[PDB]
Structures are given as C-alpha cells and as structure tokens.
Amino acid sequence: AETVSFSWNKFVPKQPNMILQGDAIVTSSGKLQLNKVDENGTPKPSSLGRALYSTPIHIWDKETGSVASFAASFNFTFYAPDTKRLADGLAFFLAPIDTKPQTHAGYLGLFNENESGDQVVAVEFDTFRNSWDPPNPHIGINVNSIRSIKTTSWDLANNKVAKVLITYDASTSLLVASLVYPSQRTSNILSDVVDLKTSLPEWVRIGFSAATGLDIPGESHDVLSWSFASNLPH
Amino acid sequence: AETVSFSWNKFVPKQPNMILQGDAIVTSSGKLQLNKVDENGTPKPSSLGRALYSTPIHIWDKETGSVASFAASFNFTFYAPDTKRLADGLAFFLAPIDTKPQTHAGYLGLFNENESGDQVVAVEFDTFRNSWDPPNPHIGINVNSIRSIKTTSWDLANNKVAKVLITYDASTSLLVASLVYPSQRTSNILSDVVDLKTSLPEWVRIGFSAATGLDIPGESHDVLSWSFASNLPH
Amino acid sequence: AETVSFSWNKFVPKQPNMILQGDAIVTSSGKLQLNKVDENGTPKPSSLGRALYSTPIHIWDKETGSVASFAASFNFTFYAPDTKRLADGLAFFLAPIDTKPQTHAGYLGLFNENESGDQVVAVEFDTFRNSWDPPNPHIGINVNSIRSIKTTSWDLANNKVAKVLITYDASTSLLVASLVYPSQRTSNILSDVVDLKTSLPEWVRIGFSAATGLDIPGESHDVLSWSFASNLPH
Amino acid sequence: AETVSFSWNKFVPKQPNMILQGDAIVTSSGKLQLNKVDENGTPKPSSLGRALYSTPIHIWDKETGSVASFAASFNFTFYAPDTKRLADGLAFFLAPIDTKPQTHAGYLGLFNENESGDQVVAVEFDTFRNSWDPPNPHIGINVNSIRSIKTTSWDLANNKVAKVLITYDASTSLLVASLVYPSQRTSNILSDVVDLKTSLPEWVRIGFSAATGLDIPGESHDVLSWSFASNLPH
Numbered sequence: 001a002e003t004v005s006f007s008w009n010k011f012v013p014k015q016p017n018m019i020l021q022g023d024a025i026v027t028s029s030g031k032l033q034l035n036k037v038d039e040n041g042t043p044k045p046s047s048l049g050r051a052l053y054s055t056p057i058h059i060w061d062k063e064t065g066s067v068a069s070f071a072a073s074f075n076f077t078f079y080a081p082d083t084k085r086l087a088d089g090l091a092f093f094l095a096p097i098d099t100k101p102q103t104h105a106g107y108l109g110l111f112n113e114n115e116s117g118d119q120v121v122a123v124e125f126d127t128f129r130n131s132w133d134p135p136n137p138h139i140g141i142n143v144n145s146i147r148s149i150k151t152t153s154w155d156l157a158n159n160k161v162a163k164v165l166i167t168y169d170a171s172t173s174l175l176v177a178s179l180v181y182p183s184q185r186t187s188n189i190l191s192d193v194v195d196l197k198t199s200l201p202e203w204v205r206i207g208f209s210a211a212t213g214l215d216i217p218g219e220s221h222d223v224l225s226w227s228f229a230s231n232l233p234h
Numbered sequence: 235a236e237t238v239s240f241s242w243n244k245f246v247p248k249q250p251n252m253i254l255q256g257d258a259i260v261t262s263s264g265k266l267q268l269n270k271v272d273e274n275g276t277p278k279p280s281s282l283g284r285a286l287y288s289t290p291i292h293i294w295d296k297e298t299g300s301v302a303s304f305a306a307s308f309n310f311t312f313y314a315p316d317t318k319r320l321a322d323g324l325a326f327f328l329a330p331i332d333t334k335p336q337t338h339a340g341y342l343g344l345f346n347e348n349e350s351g352d353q354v355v356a357v358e359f360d361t362f363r364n365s366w367d368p369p370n371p372h373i374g375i376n377v378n379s380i381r382s383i384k385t386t387s388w389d390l391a392n393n394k395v396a397k398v399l400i401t402y403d404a405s406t407s408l409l410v411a412s413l414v415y416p417s418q419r420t421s422n423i424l425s426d427v428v429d430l431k432t433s434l435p436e437w438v439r440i441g442f443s444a445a446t447g448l449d450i451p452g453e454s455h456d457v458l459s460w461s462f463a464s465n466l467p468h
Numbered sequence: 469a470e471t472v473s474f475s476w477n478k479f480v481p482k483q484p485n486m487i488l489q490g491d492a493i494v495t496s497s498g499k500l501q502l503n504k505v506d507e508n509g510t511p512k513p514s515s516l517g518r519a520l521y522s523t524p525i526h527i528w529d530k531e532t533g534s535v536a537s538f539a540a541s542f543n544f545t546f547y548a549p550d551t552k553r554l555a556d557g558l559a560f561f562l563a564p565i566d567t568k569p570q571t572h573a574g575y576l577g578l579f580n581e582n583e584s585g586d587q588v589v590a591v592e593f594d595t596f597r598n599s600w601d602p603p604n605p606h607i608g609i610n611v612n613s614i615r616s617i618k619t620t621s622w623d624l625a626n627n628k629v630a631k632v633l634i635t636y637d638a639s640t641s642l643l644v645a646s647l648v649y650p651s652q653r654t655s656n657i658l659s660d661v662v663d664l665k666t667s668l669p670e671w672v673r674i675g676f677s678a679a680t681g682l683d684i685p686g687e688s689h690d691v692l693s694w695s696f697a698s699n700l701p702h
Numbered sequence: 703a704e705t706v707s708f709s710w711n712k713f714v715p716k717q718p719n720m721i722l723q724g725d726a727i728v729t730s731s732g733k734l735q736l737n738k739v740d741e742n743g744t745p746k747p748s749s750l751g752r753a754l755y756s757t758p759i760h761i762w763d764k765e766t767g768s769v770a771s772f773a774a775s776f777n778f779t780f781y782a783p784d785t786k787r788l789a790d791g792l793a794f795f796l797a798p799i800d801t802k803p804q805t806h807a808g809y810l811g812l813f814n815e816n817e818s819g820d821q822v823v824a825v826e827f828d829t830f831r832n833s834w835d836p837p838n839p840h841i842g843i844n845v846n847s848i849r850s851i852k853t854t855s856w857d858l859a860n861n862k863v864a865k866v867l868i869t870y871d872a873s874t875s876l877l878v879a880s881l882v883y884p885s886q887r888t889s890n891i892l893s894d895v896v897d898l899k900t901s902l903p904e905w906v907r908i909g910f911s912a913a914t915g916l917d918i919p920g921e922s923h924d925v926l927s928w929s930f931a932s933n934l935p936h
C-alpha cells in the first residue's frame with residue numbers, strides 16, 4: 001500500500017504546506033478565507049480564491065491498475081449580506097498537479113465557457129442557478145464539467161458551520177458526499193459512481209475553490225478545518 | 235484518552251468475542267444471520283436474534299464528565315419473499331452490559347409494551363408501520379423508546395447490500411446515521427442530538443437486533459461485516 | 469483483515485474489560501497493582517497477581533494459514549525495599565482463553581515445576597536467578613517454557629518507570645522487545661523468531677503476571693498504562 | 703492537533719512527493735539508491751545523495767509552545783565490495799525547509815569542516831571512524847554537529863536488510879533509535895534527550911543522506927521503504 005494523511009483544526013498564515021491562489025488568504029484567526037471582503041466584511045463581487053494542499057496525491061496506478069480509496073472532511077461557512085441574492089458557491093476538488101485558476105463566478109474557478117474541462121473532479125456546493133443548474137442550492141458531483149452528473153438539495157443556512165464528509169471507495173467507484181448542520185440538526189447526502197482512472201491523472205493535487213457573484217457580492221466562503229486520508233493498494 | 239476499536243470483513247462461527255442471543259447464528263459463509271429461516275430460505279415469523287460485541291464499552295465518565303465519540307459501520311441485507319409484506323426490521327444499539335432480549339416483532343427485541351425502556355439507545359431500520367410509526371420504511375433514532383425521536387425515509391431494496399455508517403460526536407452530541415446502496419447509487423441520512431449521559435449507563439455493550447413479522451415472515455436480516463471505534467477523552 | 473486495538477493511560481477499579489486473578493487489584497490511583505503490599509508499602513512474599521484483557525484475540529487462522537502481527541506497549545515499575553535482594557519479576561504474555569494462574573515465585577504464575585508448559589508465550593522481566601537463568605536481571609523470550617529461548621541484560625532501576633514496547637511481525641515471525649528508562653536515558657532490546665502457529669492456540673487472551681520472592685519480599689510490580697493492536701490478514 | 707503521515711513499501715521513479723539531491727535516484731526496482739555505482743555495482747568514491755520528503759513538517763509551535771511527537775521507520779541496506787574497508791554511512795535527519803547538501807564523506811552530506819552546523823538533527827549509521835568518532839560502526843544521535851551526543855555499537859551485516867525505528871516523545875524529549883536484522887535475529891537500541899525547540903526551526907523537511915568513502919568506495923546505501931507519522935498538539 002501507499003498512504004498519506006493529514007489533519008488540522010486550524011490554518012496558520014504562511015503555512016508552507018498549502019498553496020494559495022486567487023484572493024485566498026489565511027487570517028490570524030485561523031480561517032482559510034477564500035474570497036476578498038469589504039471593510040464591513042462584505043464579499044466583493046468577482047472574487048476567486050483557491051487553495052491546494054501542497055503535496056501531490058497518488059490516486060491511481062497505470063502499472064498495477066489499482067485506484068486509491070480516500071476520505072476528506074471539513075468545516076465551512078459562508079456569509080451573505082443578503083440571503084436572497086446568493087452566488088456562486090464552493091467546491092472541493094481534485095486536479096492536475098499544475099492546476100491554475102479558471103473562470104470565476106458560476107465556473108467556480110475550475111472550468112471555462114466554451115472549453116472541455118481539464119481533468120477535474122469536484123464536489124460542489126452551488127448557490128446560484130446557472131443555465132445548466134437545477135433550481136435551488138444544491139450539492140453536486142462534477143466530473144470534468146460544471147454540468148453536474150448528479151445533484152441534490154442543500155438545506156443551507158447563512159453563517160452556520162457546515163460539517164462535510166466526502167468518501168471514495170475504489171471497490172465500488174462510489175463517491176459519497178454528505179453535509180451536516182449540527183446547529184440545525186439538519187442533513188444532506190449524495191452519491192454516484194465515478195471512474196477515477198478515466199477522469200484524473202495518476203497524480204493530483206486536492207483543494208478548495210470558491211467564487212462570489214459576478215456582479216453581486218453573493219456570499220463569502222470560509223473553510224475552518226481540513227482532514228484527509230488516502231490509501232492506494234498494492 | 236481511552237480507546238477501543240475493531241474490524242472484520244466476516245464473522246467466524248463460534249467466535250469468542252461475540253455474544254449471540256435469540257435465533258442469531260453465524261453461517262459457515264461468514265454471515266451473521268439474525269433470524270431463523272425455512273429450508274427454502276424463508277424467514278419464520280416471530281423470529282428474534284440479537285448479537286453483541288463481547289467487550290463492554292466505556293461511553294462516558296461520571297467522574298471526569300467526558301463522553302466518548304464513536305463510529306460504527308456495517309454491511310447488511312434482508313430478503314423478502316414478498317416485497318409487499320415486510321416486517322419488522324433491524325437495529326444497531328447500545329445497552330447495559332447485561333442486556334437481554336425483549337419483545338419481538340415491532341419491538342425489535344429491544345423494548346416492551348406497557349413498559350418504560352431500559353437505557354437503550356438505537357438506530358433502527360424499520361420496515362413495518364406500527365401505531366407509533368410514520369408511513370413507509372424508515373430509519374430512526376430511538377432513545378429509550380421504540381417511539382423514535384426522529385425519522386427519515388429509507389429507500390430500501392430487497393436482496394441488495396446496504397452500507398451503513400453511524401457516528402457520534404460528543405462535542406455536539408450529534409448522532410448521525412447514513413445508509414448507502416452502491417448497486418442503486420441511492421442514499422439516505424438522518425441526524426439529531428442525543429445526550430448519552432442521560433440515556434445510557436457508563437458502560438455498555440453494543441450490537442444488533444432484528445425481528446421478523448409477528449404472524450408473517452416479513453424479511454430476514456443478515457449482517458455481513460462490522461467495524462467500530464470509540465474514543466473517550468481525558 | 470481482522471483487527472482489534474485499545475489504549476488506556478490509566479486503569480479504573482472494577483473495569484469490566486479486564487480480568488483479575490491472584491492478588492491483582494486496581495487502585496483508586498489508576499494503577500494495576502499486581503502484588504499485595506504491607507501497610508508501609510512492603511511487598512509480601514509469595515504474592516501472585518495476574519490480569520488479562522477480557523476480549524479474546526484471534527492470533528492465527530488454521531483455515532487461511534494467516535498469522536497476526538501485533539504490538540503492545542506499557543509503562544511499569546517496581547519497588548524494592550532492598551535493592552540487593554530482588555525477586556522474581558514480571559511478564560507479558562499470551563495464553564489460552566481459559567488461562568489460570570500457575571506456579572508462583574520463579575515460575576512467574578505462568579508455568580509449573582515438573583510439567584511441560586501450556587501454550588504460553590511470554591516476554592519476561594526477570595529479577596531473580598533460578599537454576600535455568602543467566603546471571604543478572606534480564607529480559608527474556610519464553611516460548612512454552614520458563615527456560616528462555618533468548619535473553620538480554622536489563623539495566624533496571626528501582627522506583628523508575630520503564631516504557632516497554634513489544635512487537636510481532638508475522639512476515640518474519642520475529643518478536644521484538646524493547647525497554648526504555650527516560651529518567652536514565654538508558655535502553656535495552658531483544659529479538660528472536662517465534663512460530664505462533666506452533667506455540668499458541670488460534671485464540672488467546674493477553675495479559676500481565678508478576679511474582680514476589682518466595683520467602684522474601686523481592687519487589688512489587690505495578691503497571692500504569694497499556695496499549696495494544698493486532699492485525700490478522702485475509 | 704495537527705498531524706501528518708505517510709507510508710510506502712516502494713519508491714516510484716519521478717515520484718513528485720520526494721526531492722532528490724546529489725546522486726540520489728530511484729530505480730525501476732523501487733529502490734531509493736542514494737549513491738552512484740559502477741557497472742558491476744561498485745560504489746564510486748565521493749558519492750553523495752540525499753532525498754527529502756517534499757512536504758514540510760510542523761515540528762513545534764513558537765506560539766503555543768507545543769512540540770510534535772513523531773515516529774519514522776524504514777528498511778535499508780548497503781553493499782560493500784570489501785567488508786574490511788567501509789565508508790562512510792547513512793543518516794536520517796531533519797533540517798530546514800531549504801536544506802542543501804553539505805560536505806561529503808565523513809560529513810554525511812549534512813555538515814561542514816570548520817563551520818557550526820545548520821539546525822540539523824540526525825540519527826546516523828556510521829561506518830567510518832573519523833577523529834571525532836568512537837571505534838567501530840555505530841549508531842548515533844547528532845544534534846547540530848557531526849560529533850554525536852551519544853552513540854552505540856551497530857552490529858552491521860553486509861547485504862542484509864536492516865529494519866529501523868525512530869521515535870520522538872515530546873513529553874520526555876526522548877529520542878529513540880532502534881535497529882533490527884531479522885536475518886540475523888540481531889538488534890541494537892540508542893536513546894537520549896533532544897530539545898527540538900532549541901535545535902530546529904518550527905518547520906522542517908525530513909529525509910536521507912549517505913556518503914561513500916572519500917577515496918575509497920566504502921559501501922553503497924539503499925533505502926527500500928519509508929513510513930512516517932507526526933502529531934503536533936493543541
């Protein structure tokens with residue numbers, strides 16, 4: 001086997017094991033703040049921040065044919081000055097080692113209009129209905145496209161902390177995404193199969209991406225903690 | 235801290251670390267078969283089997299005031315000769331060290347008519363609507379009563395294997411129960427708060443209980459694997 | 469695979485997951501005190517206490533032929549009113565589920581004069597030279613006999629805490645025993661091969677045994693903490 | 703807490719999570735070969751290869767004052783065409799993020815003549831007696847100096863695989879280094895206290911360094927596997 005793991009209950013500014021892109025920064029308060037915010041703490045429209053764990057992960061082996069199973073968890077929140085006008089969302093994803101930020105707003109920094117997507121697999125938390133979207137805030141599974149292969153309703157709550165759990169079982173190629181609000185005693189879950197061998201390169205970096213509304217502030221997105229474990233078998 | 239854990243991908247007949255009650259047995263095939271079955275593999279009505287992990291778990295400390303966080307997973311299935319007439323269900327639970335089987339059928343071997351329940355906490359997978367029940371097969375959280383404190387719809391499927399995950403976070407006293415059918419790419423999740431300090435004794439045994447229909451065969455219930463981890467803090 | 473593990477930084481009187489034999493007790497102070505002691509804290513000669521983890525461990529599989537790898541750690545100490553007259557020692561061991569205390573003093577509660585030993589594997593910390601012994605306090609590897617298959621010098625220290633680590637690698641059948649005194653910055657290590665398949669039953673209980681001098685007080689032995697992990701492969 | 707871990711039973715050429723310096727390469731055979739070798743497999747004198755795990759480790763916190771505990775293991779070997787003329791050795795170490803190779807031969811690529819050492823902590827396996835050295839191959843604990851704070855005899859064996867275990871317990875600041883030859887059923891152990899807070903920077907990279915004899919071939923050094931875990935407390 002080949003394994004890797006990590007856990008933090010907080011971020012540390014300038015931590016050398018995280019790559020930051022876009023507007024993403026880490027506050028003295030230990031928060032990974034993905035989007036730029038006004039004085040009064042008001043998200044600025046057209047913000048785009050990404051953050052990637054520095055060490056590349058070995059996700060599958062062309063030689064042995066093995067695919068890793070993995071699991072990630074995190075806590076996050078968003079703040080919306082106007083609960084009625086949200087945009088655009090947050091995503092957890094896997095991409096090529098040299099991944100750079102893509103289009104903002106509704107493309108969540110991952111993808112691009114008029115272009116087939118890099119090899120990017122993501123789990124989205126989407127607040128804004130684009131043409132390709134279902135109605136309402138949803139959770140989705142994106143496989144090389146911002147046009148989700150499967151979705152589900154996300155009972156979101158402004159300013160409350162959401163506890164997220166993502167899991168991938170190589171044995172069934174089944175990806176599971178669950179989200180829970182302890183404050184609310186509320187919960188959501190989504191699942192589908194994903195072939196990692198056909199959607200990602202052998203080695204990838206994993207991380208976060210979030211965007212504020214194109215022309216509106218939408219909501220800011222902050223990640224509070226992060227945990228992650230991968231097991232690639234012999 | 236104080237921890238304990240275990241994992242098996244199969245059961246072994248006569249394994250000395252499992253307590254069996256009722257009709258529960260372990261097949262040569264490595265299945266923990268909770269209910270008695272006809273020649274043709276047809277569940278017998280009024281069957282009741284329970285099985286408990288032999289070592290008692292330390293769930294909370296009256297001295298320090300600490301409460302354990304824990305997590306359990308398992309795979310299970312049921313077989314119903316007649317999909318239209320199911321009964322009664324299966325449960326995962328925690329009870330006092332000296333726990334014995336209670337009433338069958340709709341009481342899931344856990345509880346009793348006309349009696350306040352021992353200190354029993356359970357997560358149920360309920361196939362039969364009793365008076366106290368909501369309509370349809372559901373998943374529930376029972377806290378000393380068969381009358382669930384909270385429920386959710388269970389998209390079940392005859393003969394398919396369900397992958398279950400139960401979690402308890404002392405920090406928020408939030409219990410989470412999730413169930414997934416990889417065959418179906420289908421999933422369900424439930425959550426609520428439970429005060430272990432007021433609902434269980436310091437030490438408990440954890441295990442399985444299932445019942446077939448009172449006067450009908452309902453469905454049989456088999457557990458295939460079991461994993462479990464507890465962490466009681468200083 | 470099949471795994472089990474546990475960890476405690478202290479013992480709790482009456483803990484239901486420990487079996488006590490002989491004079492062994494657990495103090496309110498969280499110490500597993502193996503031998504009986506005078507008012508003034510003076511060991512009584514001919515004391516014999518054993519303690520076993522309640523759940524039986526699956527050490528090897530006659531069917532699959534697999535053997536578990538495992539690891540145990542603990543902290544312990546002894547007190548000797550007279551450093552010049554020590555006896556007899558302490559042992560960590562594995563034995564049959566129904567193991568009962570054997571001969572005391574130099575037999576460490578494990579074995580018997582004039583009898584071939586049950587299926588008992590042990591790692592000893594031996595303070596008293598019996599006929600079969602090398603000179604000086606030593607650490608040994610006993611395989612069904614109190615006459616160690618291999619030994620090494622133990623730089624012991626009265627009243628100081630020793631940190632012990634025992635490991636078993638099925639892949640090489642190599643058992644490793646290491647002991648460290650942080651106070652002293654001193655350390656000792658021993659290793660040899662042991663065939664578990666030929667020296668123990670499939671299932672065993674693991675635990676501690678200690679004896680005070682036959683006609684002298686020797687030293688008392690206390691275990692402070694215990695950790696343990698086993699992995700039996702498919 | 704803050705943790706990180708990893709395990710590999712083999713290296714993969716071009717793996718993106720390892721930094722290679724000097725002559726270090728990874729063979730198709732999955733071996734991390736630290737030193738350059740003739741056609742016939744004969745070490746070339748004045749070889750110097752280092753290899754570092756790419757992600758920086760958080761070893762202590764100036765803010766909280768906490769220091770990590772950690773553990774590393776590995777398998778390694780050396781080949782000596784002439785068992786009577788060995789040089790110079792291998793080391794496991796921790797250094798600053800931007801660590802570069804230093805002096806070769808007896809300086810093990812870590813240090814320099816006439817210079818006080820960077821903040822480098824190491825555990826050495828030393829085959830050649832330099833002026834500062836004790837007689838015979840030894841294991842040592844180097845703290846900012848190639849002049850070991852403590853040493854012990856190393857019962858080495860040409861061409862056999864050694865299994866190494868290094869541990870650091872913040873609670874006692876005690877570093878433990880153990881080495882075992884299963885082929886030989888032979889073992890060695892060393893321990894001393896090390897103040898990480900005064901000998902390393904908060905963040906470091908960990909890795910391997912080995913050197914062949916100045917003017918002689920000495921022995922080659924190959925690392926076969928690597929495991930590592932760190933836990934930095936709140």
Ligand SMILES: [Ca+2]
Nearest residue numbers: 126128129130
């Ligand atoms: Ca959208």
Ligand SMILES: [Ca+2]
Nearest residue numbers: 360362363364
């Ligand atoms: Ca019911």
Ligand SMILES: [Ca+2]
Nearest residue numbers: 594596597598
């Ligand atoms: Ca003796």
Ligand SMILES: [Ca+2]
Nearest residue numbers: 828830831832
């Ligand atoms: Ca030297």
Ligand SMILES: [Mn+2]
Nearest residue numbers: 126133140148
């Ligand atoms: Mn969407």
Ligand SMILES: [Mn+2]
Nearest residue numbers: 360367374382
């Ligand atoms: Mn119900």
Ligand SMILES: [Mn+2]
Nearest residue numbers: 594601608616
């Ligand atoms: Mn002896």
Ligand SMILES: [Mn+2]
Nearest residue numbers: 828835842850
């Ligand atoms: Mn040296």
